[PDB]
Amino acid sequence: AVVKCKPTSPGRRHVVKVVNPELHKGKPFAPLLEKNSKSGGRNNNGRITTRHIGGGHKQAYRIVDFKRNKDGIPAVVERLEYDPNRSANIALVLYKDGERRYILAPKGLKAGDQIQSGVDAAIKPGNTLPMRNIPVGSTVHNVEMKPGKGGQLARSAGTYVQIVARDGAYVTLRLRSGEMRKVEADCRATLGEVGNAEHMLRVLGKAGAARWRGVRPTVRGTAMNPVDHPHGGGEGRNFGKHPVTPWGVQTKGKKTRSNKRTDKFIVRRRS
Amino acid sequence: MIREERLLKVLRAPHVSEKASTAMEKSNTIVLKVAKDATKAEIKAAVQKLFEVEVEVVNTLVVKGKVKRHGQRIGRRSDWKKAYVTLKEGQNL
Amino acid sequence: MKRTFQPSVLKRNRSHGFRARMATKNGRQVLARRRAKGRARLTVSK
Amino acid sequence: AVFQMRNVD
RNA sequence: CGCCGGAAGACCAAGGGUUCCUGUCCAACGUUAAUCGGGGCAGGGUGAGUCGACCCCUAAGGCGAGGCCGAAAGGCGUAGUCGAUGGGAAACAGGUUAAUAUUCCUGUACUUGGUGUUACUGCGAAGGGGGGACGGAGAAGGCUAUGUUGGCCGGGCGACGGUUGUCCCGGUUUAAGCGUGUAGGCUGGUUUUCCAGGCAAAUCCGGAAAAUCAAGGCUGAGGCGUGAUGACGAGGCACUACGGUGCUGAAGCAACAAAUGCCCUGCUUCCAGGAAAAGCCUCUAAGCAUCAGGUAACAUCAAAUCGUACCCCAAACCGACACAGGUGGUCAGGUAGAGAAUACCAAGGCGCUUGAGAGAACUCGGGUGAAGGAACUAGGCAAAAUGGUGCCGUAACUUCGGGAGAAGGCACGCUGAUAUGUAGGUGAGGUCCCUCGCGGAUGGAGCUGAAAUCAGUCGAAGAUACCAGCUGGCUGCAACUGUUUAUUAAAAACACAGCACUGUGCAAACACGAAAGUGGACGUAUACGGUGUGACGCCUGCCCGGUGCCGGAAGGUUAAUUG
RNA sequence: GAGGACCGAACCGACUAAUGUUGAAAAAUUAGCGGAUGACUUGUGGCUGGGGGUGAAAGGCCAAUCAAACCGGGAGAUAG
């Protein structure tokens, strides 16, 4: 339930906060917390391998149970909690043995829900069961790319992946990008979709809003110099040159992809 | 500990001064130079036998040698360790 | 105006101390030249 | 101080 | 006499390295003379179980057994190790020196270990859990540092009209520790049984069933006692190298105000969701199991090594100088005031290492000026002016927050009365209730104290000093807050949220690196990179010939290769 | 009690003008100014090393020097 900010002073007028009242305010479940120091975008060489990354508020990473290895055991939600690292909300479910692990939150999730991973598990949202048991066309997220590896697919908020086919050991998936890709049926996946569909609505609303996100200001290359960027000079803005990356790779209209090994999995290019 | 021979070199020379004389007539703490190393305990044992008097408490400090110079050439002196051996009611010489 | 020289003994020994010369093969060669040249101070410290 | 500038006549 | 007094006072770290103290000296050092000095020479000075370092632990990182990789040098990195700007046990008052004091002395203490005696008893990791362990902003409340007034004690009857009184001056200071556990804050406690969890196990944590009871516990300033029969103490008695040393030494209370300090690592609230490990509290395992060990009372021993002087916004550090520059943290008095602004003062430190004159131009820093009031000038440049609080009132326009303190005015001192000090705030005695405490109600003295009305009064001027917005209109540009050529350009330039295009399915694209390995990211197309444009509103037309690129695979053309 | 909110010290920044120009100072002082709860400032300690680094982009900055730092070497380079 987004609420547009009132125009009290500049840098506040355009802001649109995305409040989430059902979230449980308070200190995070401490033992699973661990350090996540900012890299600054630099590597071991100390070179800036990736620009426009630095600064921002400190963040603490939290482990999440992608594998859902505890099959059979019933689980119950305790409370939703904010995750700085990801657009998707995370929830601290309570296993019957008393063990606790974070999990991505399905749109149908509420406090006290009886979600349960397992091969024999009933088909309700929030469950994580292998796709071989999954009916065609159901909304699916957190799909493993490899058997038991975790679930790299559809981790982002509002994402969902339909399963349009099941022929062979593989099961075809419909990615949010619209790109088609085969995946083995043995891989685990979560039913339904993550509920943070309101995430796109945020618009920051000020120049300093990106500063805590670790984002750094972008300098266009036409404003630069020929020695620093291929674009530049010309005395008074200008342009002329065909657009390019600073390292000279052609921007706009050049597929940089070159994997070959994974082309077998690519049923179709994204549209 | 003793090892009598190590103890003997600790008491290389007494260090008389106008301030030290006041320490003996009032605080009853004899003042003398000691070895560059050693410890509070070894200095105490040196007084227990050779000075044949009981020690109350030992205190130590290190005065840095003042730099000297003559022309472009310079000549730093040498460091030495002062010590404060407080004496009990049994003090003599 | 602030001077370029802003002394700190802790930074000095870490950057220009005898230990830094031994940190790499290139640094050990630096000491070798000072010795053949003859010097009162192979490095600097206290 | 020496300065710089240019003598463009 | 004059200056600072949120410092030009005081302290620590950084850094400097005897500049500290004393005697003596004046060649050179000091922008002058110099008996003086941060100068020459010599002597003296730095006292630690509990201040800090060392030590234990860890961040960003560095190094790195093997290993991976690279012509060689070398690069990366595991287990490890190092790394404070962090965390981790414990000393406070008085006195003394020419210079050092939480170090020595005096008084009262405290922590962690070794050993011994006695009592009780399941003790034991590199492991599990708990704890340590943390954000921004805001709101007050309860207190202390500290201040004012009164009381008390000691001293003073005034160089000139008054001053034995409602007068003047000074003091009224006391810590750690220990006992007490309040103002508050947090949480329902105890017991029994069971478990797919916490790599092994578990009495601990967690989960599940019951029973019982309602206050069980933790945290916590400060106050009150003790510490304190003292110590300090204005001022005297006494010797006196006139630089001081011994002895004695009165009162040592109350009320109010009160913080930026404390309770507070709290509470409330908001996204931007807020280090790491050890010490510490517990749990067992491999084990010992009458032991060793564990806990408690007493006694004893040990707490080493190193720093400790001086300078600390400067004459000593950094600036070639005894240089109008630069340098982090801590201590925060009186009056006025919103205030750490500013003026005058306390404590305290200084009059800044050339002076004495003369009173020309001209120059620099200021004051005032009759008449005019931008006529000056590239240009209202510079000066001048506006300036506070309370109240009245305030247009076009707008994204309905603005514009706006728009503009434009009134009131402002002192004294009396309302009320010999009011509204309020603080709060004693008396009275009563108490599972009886640092209680509550009742009660209202005393103290403190604005703001207002009326009347009177003085000056040319009462926000009188310092302090302290000039305002309005049209328009260009950029949305705005910011950032930018350190050392001639602060802008229309850059950034900007937003919009769009394009690349990317994860061992991603991209980037560093001959590689290995990292970053992206411990992210997953609502994500990330690149490019363009630059809030918002109205929108964003046409052209693919040329150039670039995508898509397409027959044909034309064509390399190494085959010969 | 919200704000890259308002006035305004510390703090940070350096728009105007005078003085200074072998200055007290190889960029300061004086009288005004901007920001001052944040895209803030700063202490301490690390990281990126020369055709490279870093840059809210001035080709600025990298020890008073930067359209390619400094040191040593080739080197007594070449110079019609």
Side-chain angles (χ1 to χ4, degrees):
Chain A
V2 295
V3 175
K4 294 177 179 178
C5 297
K6 290 184 179 298
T8 59
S9 66
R12 180 63 178 166
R13 183 186 295 274
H14 299 290
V15 179
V16 177
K17 293 166 62 181
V18 181
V19 294
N20 193 342
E22 64 184 343
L23 294 176
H24 186 278
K25 292 188 295 184
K27 301 300 182 181
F29 181 77
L32 294 176
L33 296 175
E34 63 183 343
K35 183 180 67 64
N36 191 30
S37 64
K38 184 67 179 295
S39 64
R42 293 174 177 81
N43 61 345
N44 57 31
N45 290 283
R47 299 294 181 86
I48 298 170
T49 59
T50 300
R51 293 173 297 180
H52 302 165
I53 293 171
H57 188 278
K58 181 179 75 179
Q59 295 178 337
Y61 176 78
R62 297 177 182 84
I63 297 99
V64 178
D65 189 4
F66 296 158
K67 294 177 179 178
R68 298 296 299 277
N69 289 336
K70 292 181 69 66
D71 289 346
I73 296 98
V76 59
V77 178
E78 293 178 350
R79 65 184 183 276
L80 295 174
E81 293 178 351
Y82 177 78
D83 189 4
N85 291 282
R86 293 181 181 175
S87 297
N89 290 336
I90 59 173
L92 181 63
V93 293
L94 177 62
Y95 296 139
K96 300 300 182 181
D97 59 357
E99 184 177 2
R100 294 179 178 85
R101 293 181 182 175
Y102 295 95
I103 55 100
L104 276 66
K107 184 179 179 180
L109 187 145
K110 289 181 295 296
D113 286 346
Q114 295 295 101
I115 63 171
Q116 184 174 355
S117 64
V119 177
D120 57 354
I123 299 171
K124 62 180 293 180
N127 288 339
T128 301
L129 59 83
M131 292 183 285
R132 65 179 181 273
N133 290 337
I134 290 173
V136 177
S138 64
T139 58
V140 176
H141 65 284
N142 194 342
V143 177
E144 295 177 351
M145 292 178 71
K146 301 301 286 185
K149 184 177 180 179
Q152 295 178 337
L153 295 175
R155 292 185 181 176
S156 179
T159 304
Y160 63 90
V161 176
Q162 187 174 355
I163 298 170
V164 297
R166 289 175 60 85
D167 54 351
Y170 295 93
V171 291
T172 303
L173 271 65
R174 184 182 295 275
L175 296 175
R176 179 60 179 165
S177 178
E179 183 177 1
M180 302 303 293
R181 181 178 181 273
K182 294 176 179 178
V183 179
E184 296 178 352
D186 289 346
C187 296
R188 295 183 181 276
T190 303
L191 296 174
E193 63 184 343
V194 57
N196 192 341
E198 294 177 351
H199 184 65
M200 69 189 86
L201 275 68
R202 64 173 184 182
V203 294
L204 276 66
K206 62 181 177 181
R211 296 287 295 174
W212 59 77
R213 292 179 177 84
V215 179
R216 297 180 66 249
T218 299
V219 176
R220 65 183 184 274
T222 187
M224 294 178 182
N225 297 128
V227 61
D228 290 346
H229 191 277
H231 299 166
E235 184 67 15
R237 294 182 182 175
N238 290 337
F239 185 75
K241 299 180 185 297
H242 295 82
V244 290
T245 61
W247 290 272
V249 177
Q250 184 64 58
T251 302
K252 294 184 175 74
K254 182 174 178 290
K255 294 184 175 74
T256 59
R257 182 179 180 273
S258 177
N259 193 342
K260 293 184 174 74
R261 181 182 64 197
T262 58
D263 287 348
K264 183 173 178 290
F265 295 159
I266 306 301
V267 177
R268 183 182 65 195
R269 296 287 294 173
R270 66 183 183 276
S271 296
Chain B
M1 293 178 181
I2 294 99
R3 297 295 181 191
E4 294 178 351
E5 295 84 357
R6 180 60 179 165
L7 184 144
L8 298 174
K9 294 177 179 178
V10 178
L11 299 176
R12 61 180 295 176
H15 186 278
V16 295
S17 64
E18 71 281 4
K19 182 179 179 180
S21 296
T22 59
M24 293 178 71
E25 63 184 343
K26 183 180 67 65
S27 296
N28 291 283
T29 300
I30 185 169
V31 178
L32 57 82
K33 186 186 293 179
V34 296
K36 179 60 175 172
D37 50 355
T39 188
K40 294 178 70 67
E42 292 178 350
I43 297 170
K44 182 178 179 180
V47 180
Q48 293 295 101
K49 290 181 294 297
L50 276 66
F51 293 161
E52 64 185 343
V53 292
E54 294 177 351
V55 176
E56 182 67 15
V57 63
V58 177
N59 290 334
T60 57
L61 61 83
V62 176
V63 175
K64 271 68 180 180
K66 293 166 62 181
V67 175
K68 266 67 181 180
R69 66 183 183 276
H70 294 83
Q72 295 178 336
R73 180 60 180 165
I74 60 101
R76 184 178 178 85
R77 291 175 63 86
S78 178
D79 291 347
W80 58 275
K81 184 178 179 180
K82 186 186 292 179
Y84 296 140
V85 178
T86 301
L87 296 175
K88 294 181 181 297
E89 185 65 14
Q91 77 285 359
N92 290 336
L93 275 67
Chain C
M1 293 179 71
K2 183 178 179 180
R3 182 61 62 185
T4 59
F5 182 78
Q6 294 300 321
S8 178
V9 178
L10 179 62
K11 290 179 178 178
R12 179 177 62 83
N13 297 131
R14 293 183 181 175
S15 178
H16 302 291
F18 177 81
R19 298 297 302 278
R21 300 290 182 268
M22 296 301 294
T24 187
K25 180 67 179 296
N26 292 284
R28 289 192 294 271
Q29 294 178 336
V30 177
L31 296 175
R33 292 175 296 181
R34 298 295 294 274
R35 293 181 182 174
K37 184 178 179 180
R39 183 68 69 183
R41 57 180 67 88
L42 276 65
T43 57
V44 61
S45 295
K46 62 179 293 180
Chain D
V2 303
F3 296 160
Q4 293 178 336
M5 297 296 180
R6 294 177 63 185
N7 290 336
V8 177
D9 289 346

